[PDB]
Amino acid sequence: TNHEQVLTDYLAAFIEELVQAGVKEAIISPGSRSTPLALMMAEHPILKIYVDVDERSAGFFALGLAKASKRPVVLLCTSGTAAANYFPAVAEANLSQIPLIVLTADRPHELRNVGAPQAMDQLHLYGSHVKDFTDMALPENSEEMLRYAKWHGSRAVDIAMKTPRGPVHLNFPLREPLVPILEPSPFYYTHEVLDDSSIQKMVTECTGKKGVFVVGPIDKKELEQPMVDLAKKLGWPILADPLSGLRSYGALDEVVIDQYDAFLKEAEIIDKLTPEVVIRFGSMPVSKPLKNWLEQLSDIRFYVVDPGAAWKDPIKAVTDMIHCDERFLLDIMQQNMPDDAKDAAWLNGWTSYNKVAREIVLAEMANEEGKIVAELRRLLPDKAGLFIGNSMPIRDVDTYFSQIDKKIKMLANRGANGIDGVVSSALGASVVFQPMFLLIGDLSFYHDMNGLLMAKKYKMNLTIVIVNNDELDFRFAAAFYDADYHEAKSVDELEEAIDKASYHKGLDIIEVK
Amino acid sequence: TNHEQVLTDYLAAFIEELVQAGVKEAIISPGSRSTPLALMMAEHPILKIYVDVDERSAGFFALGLAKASKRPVVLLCTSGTAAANYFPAVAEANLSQIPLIVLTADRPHELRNVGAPQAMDQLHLYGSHVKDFTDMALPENSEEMLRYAKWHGSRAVDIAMKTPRGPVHLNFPLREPLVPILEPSPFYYTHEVLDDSSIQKMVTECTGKKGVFVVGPIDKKELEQPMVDLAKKLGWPILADPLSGLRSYGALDEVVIDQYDAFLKEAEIIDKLTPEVVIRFGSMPVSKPLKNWLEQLSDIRFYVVDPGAAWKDPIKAVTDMIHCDERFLLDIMQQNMPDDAKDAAWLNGWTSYNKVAREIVLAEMANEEGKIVAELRRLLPDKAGLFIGNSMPIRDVDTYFSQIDKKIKMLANRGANGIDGVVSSALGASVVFQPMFLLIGDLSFYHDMNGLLMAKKYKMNLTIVIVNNDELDFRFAAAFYDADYHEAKSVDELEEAIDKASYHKGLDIIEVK
Question: What residues form the membrane-spanning segments (chains A, B)?
């Protein structure tokens, strides 16, 4: 019934439900108004905490951690411009379907839009870029209002984790004094399914047709193998994006095509490889010549599998929009599509151009923006993570990273793209996948340079490769963040750097000028 | 009539009107979609350009430049998360009434919300935090549409510069190819006034009353002297904020009170200094004991002068809201208020506590977070600029920076406050006021560390004083950005650092641990 108890009961009810609904990590930024929420989250036994004093960096850190783990991740910042720094990562989380619980501390009603210090309008702060907005009540501790606090904690995580996944924003007006009572201590998975009538139409329509699988960047785990099996069963090629995982799932394969970016630039190859059906999985692939090829082809059956109804199709090519779970579709197609449907000449044609274009690529790579990918492909461990920057590193990983027999989790921010926040993204992802590697340009590296503090203060393992095409001497940046600096001037100098980097748990930075 | 000419005619009409309406500077961030707008702004003869690759830093740079010069300043970035990085500075510009023309490049309609790379929803991106939003047409070059492009260029700057001043957002959908034709080359002030009936009511109501002037952070230039004259004429004290300019306008004074933060904490002094009227100018002062004092007093006449109708009053103390120009009000009060109204005992009481509290402060400052302000007060030139960070440096400049007889422009981000972007803010302001000094905490310095690139690549003069109260060794940061590093361990070590800093045109950084 006293002010500080009221504040403690209210927040504890909320925070307890977040953890009980699956939040294990919180990414906190400090400030006056965020203090009571930060202190009480710290007191929670199960809940782990990371402190990032740059809110922009905190947002991308949370993003990367939630993208890699499929876990809902809390953000917490104070009132004022701090909340606005979450915006780039929230917009990214929106488009890449990443479950961020963004909690913004705020002034109380008597201090809202009144000219108070550290205070701005935080109602619908991120606009359409969140799944849900809640302006929470001022702290109360009645039976009704405590259950309300629990209810909103459960709803936040549920909405964020329900497909299509995405960011959820909760605004907390907090009235002074913000001193909580810490002594004594205050402390169902659904998927989309197609109908039996609806699967029969699809099965019959492409039962003996020349089809192509197109897989772009995809979220879901262990979808590599059953996809490979189906394409093998049908005799269909898979045009696999580097971010699909099919180019690095730990096995060599007879259906995965990886040189399509090269050979679809040529006009006669465009004509000869013309399919009857196309089935898309995941986002759109990064390849512009593939994009232009899929745009050009008409009078085909263009399926896209989109369980979240996000309507990602910048080509407007869709004929049949499929709103179901990817693993479900692959399994029913593995059970119901015939075995005797195999045309050997169809797959053969695709694999032939693929073998030919591999030679054209490998004839040049014994001489450096393409050779850096090729050297990285060989030097990487059998189980590793690779975050790729959105500039030139993503176009060169499409050309010079063919299929390898190592398990490599490849991650990029492919929603709203952008050169911002990719260091913190990689660093958040490094909590899940080890060892973590970052192929990055100099512009992106500078942009999110101060996110390297998280690697220093939490003793994280990340190997950074900077393609500096370009006035900046990055040795001083390395020394500042306690990083081991390496300058690779040759192919052999890169080999020594990678070997040294995997040898110690810590931050490594390899600059290639 | 051809695509690239259309694009050139459209943008040139817009850009020409911006310059013709008073835009002299543009702050550009690079990218694919921003390229045609950036190239053509570069071709404009009068328009000066600054390139900031961090969009967050660019926003605060523009903010600082526009705050210092009262000039409208263009921002330009590419599509995607780049636009979202402008948000903290836009929210700040909104509350601090700063005229930013924010231009965001965008995908065309066929690539909007369709799953395209580097693309997000940019309609009403900043929400209520801008004065105006325009989604511009796709480039056309007809007589109607070219005048439309001119019209929007004039409207943008006008709305941004009309009081209450603020940010204006224009979104530009641009269709590929984005290659402009650069060869050959494509290239009233109103103020609020009170009525004669309305001034007579105010003049008579405080014609012989014990009144107090309260001046917080204020925009308007040369408002120092006529304010001083009126308070001298009336025998009224001025409780001047450090950011009012009255504490450093180049003259010592017999009405400016600067120790109110100290002596209004005491209960009997609160009671004895009780006025009959209060007149506020500018924003709310940073002093919490002054805030609490003005809150506590009742049955008074509380005037606030607010020409922009922003209603800045977190105390809700207003009795008479005055919507007119500050210079106008001071001049008519200088002409119409009587001379024989002077009560000597009223001003005497205020100046007495002020003299007493100065002794209490100066008795301690011969021994370091307060002594750093006091040393800075003495060591500064006769004509200088000082940007202050929003953390502990603003509370200590209120206590330990009494009135000096030097002209010092003092600047802070006092709208939405926040520890973010104050380096770029100071660096933008450094274009106008020279020499520029920055008193800053370590948290703020880290937050906007990468804004120091602007000091390096444009060879700017800024002296940074870091109050490191606190793992980071800032020498490596200094070496990275070509800055002269100084470590001040004593009072005399600070003197040597300041002397060296003012001696060369370039970036200086003084750390006090």
Answer: none
